[PDB]
Amino acid sequence: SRQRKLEALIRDPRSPINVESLLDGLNSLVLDLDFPALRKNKNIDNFLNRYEKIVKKIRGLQMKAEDYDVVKVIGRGAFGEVQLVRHKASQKVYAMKLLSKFEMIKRSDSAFFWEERDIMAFANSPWVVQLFYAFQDDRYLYMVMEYMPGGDLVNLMSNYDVPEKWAKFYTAEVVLALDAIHSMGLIHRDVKPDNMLLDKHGHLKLADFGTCMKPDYISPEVLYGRECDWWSVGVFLYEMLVGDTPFYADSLVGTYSKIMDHKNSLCFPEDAEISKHAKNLICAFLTDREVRLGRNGVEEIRQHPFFKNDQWHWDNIRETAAPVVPELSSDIDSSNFDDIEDVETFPIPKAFVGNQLPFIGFTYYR
Amino acid sequence: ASRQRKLEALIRDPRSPINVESLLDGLNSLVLDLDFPALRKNKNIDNFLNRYEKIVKKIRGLQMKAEDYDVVKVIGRGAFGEVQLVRHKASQKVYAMKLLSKFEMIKRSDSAFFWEERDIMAFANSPWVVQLFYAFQDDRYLYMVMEYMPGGDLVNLMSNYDVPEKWAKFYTAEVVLALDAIHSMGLIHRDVKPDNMLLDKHGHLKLADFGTCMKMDETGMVHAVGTPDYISPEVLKSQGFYGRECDWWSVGVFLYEMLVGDTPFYADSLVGTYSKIMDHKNSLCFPEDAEISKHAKNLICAFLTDREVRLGRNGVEEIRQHPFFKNDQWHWDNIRETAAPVVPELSSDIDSSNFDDIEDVETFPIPKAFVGNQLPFIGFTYYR
Ligand SMILES: COc1cccc([C@@H](C)NC(=O)N2CCC(c3ccncc3)CC2)c1
Ligand SMILES: COc1cccc([C@@H](C)NC(=O)N2CCC(c3ccncc3)CC2)c1
């Protein structure tokens, strides 16, 4: 009557009280209590003695980091690292992103991962890196994703002088990816080549959504709407064609000052060639917000003359042949990823603290 | 799925402590023990609360709660609460609902008894046990919704009838089988007595109030109990390690009260009663005015010995073949499906005439730090 409606809420995996969330709620509770200090309270000690045994079983059964073998580390970021991994049981290969709980609490920002998870879990988009499994332990959050063995576009740009044909393609794929993120009612903000990866067939998918909300690449307005992503597309196209970013400076303060002054501070080096159409398009993205391209939807971008080739159409671009198909030795060839160089947890508390509380609901099995 | 079948098994089993009801208790319990403006000074908490705030207020609306029922009359009062005759507002059906103050249970640190009580009533599938339909909770109380038993207790029966031996053969036999079922479940009642013996719509026995039931250890033993008259001597010396036979003592005492009229160790003081129970070898004689067969005398004496040679040590079967129980009225396999001695005649679906009327509350302090008052009540909630 009501109890149908209730059982609906428990079965919906978008709901914050799905079964995974409720078990997080239990494991989180136990972890924030099981310290010999807090077991001085009888209420706690009783409760813990009951659930002690069952929770230790649950942990065995739930997905955990010991289910995977780490092959190589392939990424490092603010709050953790990205690992190439093999699921021991299934033998399949994934990319797994880790996030230190200690660090996220300590340094202010510990909400970003919700949208990141949801985007990757639920986009059904071939422009988004799909999330398969999210889970957690005492120390870390984990996100198991489809590995993208073609690497980022920094790694592409460093290894190729990039012709205009290639840039038409990679740009077009970006404008499509963003339109999808926009269709989901999100602004990326931090659009850049490090957040642009290449699949087994050298086609684009986006990853790292830490910034999605409901320096060189940043827009003036940021220093407020979706148009700021489209700025960053202009900057990208420029870096591909020219070689440097269009507001490069020695200092960061220099870069900022240049971005503000963009009306004056943008000229195109005469030693690099670039078409009129391509010049025009970059300038159309690098205006003030009020008359920037992509305010009035995606379609005005799509019909811009620059994008005319006799190679692909907008509806079929991702199903055409990519510029650079990677050649890969095995299911673990991380040749398009540079190697990586090289931990403090919470204090044992005296009273109750609730460190695990902002991570209840994270766990997701697809 | 190798493991994740096994996991989803544990969540679907309603005997398991992490069924869906338990996990939601775990959530509601958490929120209640945190949502105080004092503890929201911790940011971790306040974030978490602001997320779940909205969904939890929805959940409460949908879950079973006390406002789903209308209270008709109070029909029982006991250590940690009361028993209410109630009507489910929606379905219109009538139940008996037993309440337990959370404050009181914590304060007077008996707060485990309800687990066996709930489990017994939920999961006996016995027609000797009062069935539990729904258990739920609020900030303040536990609730247990049971089949109402409009025939009342056997105190109320014994007070309104001189009880013949034919009737006592019946009511005793029904007790014998009821206890054997509780014994089959690996439990000792301890506090067996007429107040804990109720009568259905057809005047047949069911047991209720299991606050004293404790689970047997590997041998069949266990380590206050009960009202004094019905207690056994061995229970009084652990109270300075005892088995199932102590229930069977209380059966002897019951049979005596039915046939004689008074309890066999009555006294003015309680101390008097205790002293008599210890001295049972001497202090038990039968009033010469009292109408009672040799068989019935013999059987009472067989229950009221020292533990070591008491009847029902060596299973139920030796009791069942005792000659006393011979009649040409019922058999052991069909007793509960025969006509009861006293079928109640009831005016309405709410006739509590077989229940005496009753006479006519402090909650927790708002805490400064985290306290966890709701923690020992996680898992209670049960929808049948
Ligand atoms: C703040 O904490 C962080 C920790 C690690 C990484 C990051 C940021 C800097 N980058 C990502 O999150 N990325 C890019 C690589 C993606 C990838 C790489 C290989 N294969 C598949 C995906 C995974 C998402 C931040
Ligand atoms: C320690 O706290 C307590 C709180 C309340 C009650 C009690 C004890 C005294 N009695 C029960 O528990 N009973 C007897 C009546 C039963 C019944 C009455 C009508 N219809 C159906 C069942 C329900 C269980 C103790």
The CATH number of residue B190's host domain is 1.10.510.10
Q: Among the atoms of ligand 2, which is closest to the Cα of residue B83?
A: 5
Identify the DSSP state of A187. Answer: B
- From A179, A54, A184, select the one nearest A121 (Cα to Cα): A184
Q: What's the rounded Cα separation, in Å, for the pair A357 and A24?
A: 9
Q: How far apart are CA A229 and CA A234, in angstroms?
A: 9
Q: Which DSSP symbol is given to B130?
A: P
User: Between A29, A58, A355, which is nearest B44 by CB?
Assistant: A355
Q: Give ligand 2 pocket residues (Cβ under 6 A).
A: B 75-76, 78-83, 96, 98, 100, 130, 146, 148-149, 198, 208-209, 211
SS3 A169: helix
Contacts of A326 (CB under 8 A, 6+ apart): A149, A150, A151, A198, A200, A202, A335, A336
User: Rounded distance, CA B383 to CA A9, Å?
Assistant: 17
Is B51 an interface residue toward A (CB < 8 Å)?
A: yes
The two tokens of residue A242 are 């020219």
Q: Which two tokens stand for residue A284?
A: 């159309």
The answer to whether residues B295 and B323 touch, using CB atoms and an 8 Å cutoff, is: yes
Q: CB under 8 Å to B280, separation ≥6 — which residues?
A: B233, B265, B304
Which are the contacts of A48, defined by CB distance < 8 A and separation ≥ 6? A30, A33, A34, A39
The answer to whether the CB of A191 falls within 8 A of the CB of A236 is yes
Q: Residues near B66 by Cβ (< 8 Å), separated by ≥ 6?
A: B138, B141, B143
Query: A304 — phi, psi (to 5°)?
Result: -50, 135
Residue at A76: amino acid letter: R
Q: Do residues A29 and A355 lie in contact, with contact meaning Cβ atoms separated by under 8 Å?
A: no
Interchain pair A29, B24: CB under 8 A: no
* Integer CA distances (angstroms), A197 to A150, A208, A209, B93, B148, in order: 7, 10, 13, 63, 67
* Residue B258 tokens, joined: 């039915």
- Give dist(CA A228, CA A233) in Å, integer: 9
Cβ A49 vs Cβ A35: under 8 Å: no
Contact B372, B44 (CB under 8 A): no
Angle at B132 between CA B126 and CA B138, to 5 degrees: 160
The answer to whether A16 touches B51, Cβ cutoff 8 Å, is: yes
If you take atom 24 of ligand 2, which residue's CA is the nearest one?
B209
Cβ proximity of A188 and A233 under 8 Å: no
**Which distant-in-sequence residues (6+ apart) come within 8 Å of B260 by Cβ?**
B286, B287, B290, B292
User: Taking a C-beta distance cutoff of 8 angstroms, is the pair B231, B225 a contact?
Assistant: yes
DSSP line for B22-58: HHHHHHHHHHHHH-STTGGGSHHHHHHHHHHHHHHHH
B250 is in which domain, residue-wise?
152-337
Measured CA to CA, the distance from residue A292 to residue A189 in angstroms comes to: 15
Token digits of residue B357? 């009327």
A144 C-beta closer than 6 A to ligand 1: no
Q: Which candidate from B48, B369, B375 shows the least CB-CB separation from A357?
A: B48
Resolution value, angstrom units = 3.0
Q: Identify the three-state secondary structure at position A167.
A: helix
Size of interface A-B (CB pairs under 8 A): 100
| Cα→Cα distances B342→A21, A258, B174, B195, Å | 54, 99, 14, 17
> Which of the 8 DSSP states describes residue A287?
S
Q: CA of B77: how far to CAs of B73, B107, B186, B189, B351, in Å?
A: 12, 18, 28, 20, 18
* Cα gap B113→A196, rounded to integer Å: 61
- Cα within 13 Å of Cα(B335), Cβ side: 23
Q: What's the gap in Å between A95 CA and the centre of ligand 1? A: 9
- Would you give the distance in Å from CA B333 to the centre of its chain? 25
Lookup: tokens for B292: 């009672």
B3 in contact with A at a CB cutoff of 8 Å? Answer: yes
Expt. technique:
X-ray
CA distance A109 to A103: 9
Distance of alpha carbon B45 from alpha carbon B28, whole angstroms = 14
**Residue A311 sits at the chain B interface (C-beta within 8 Å):** no
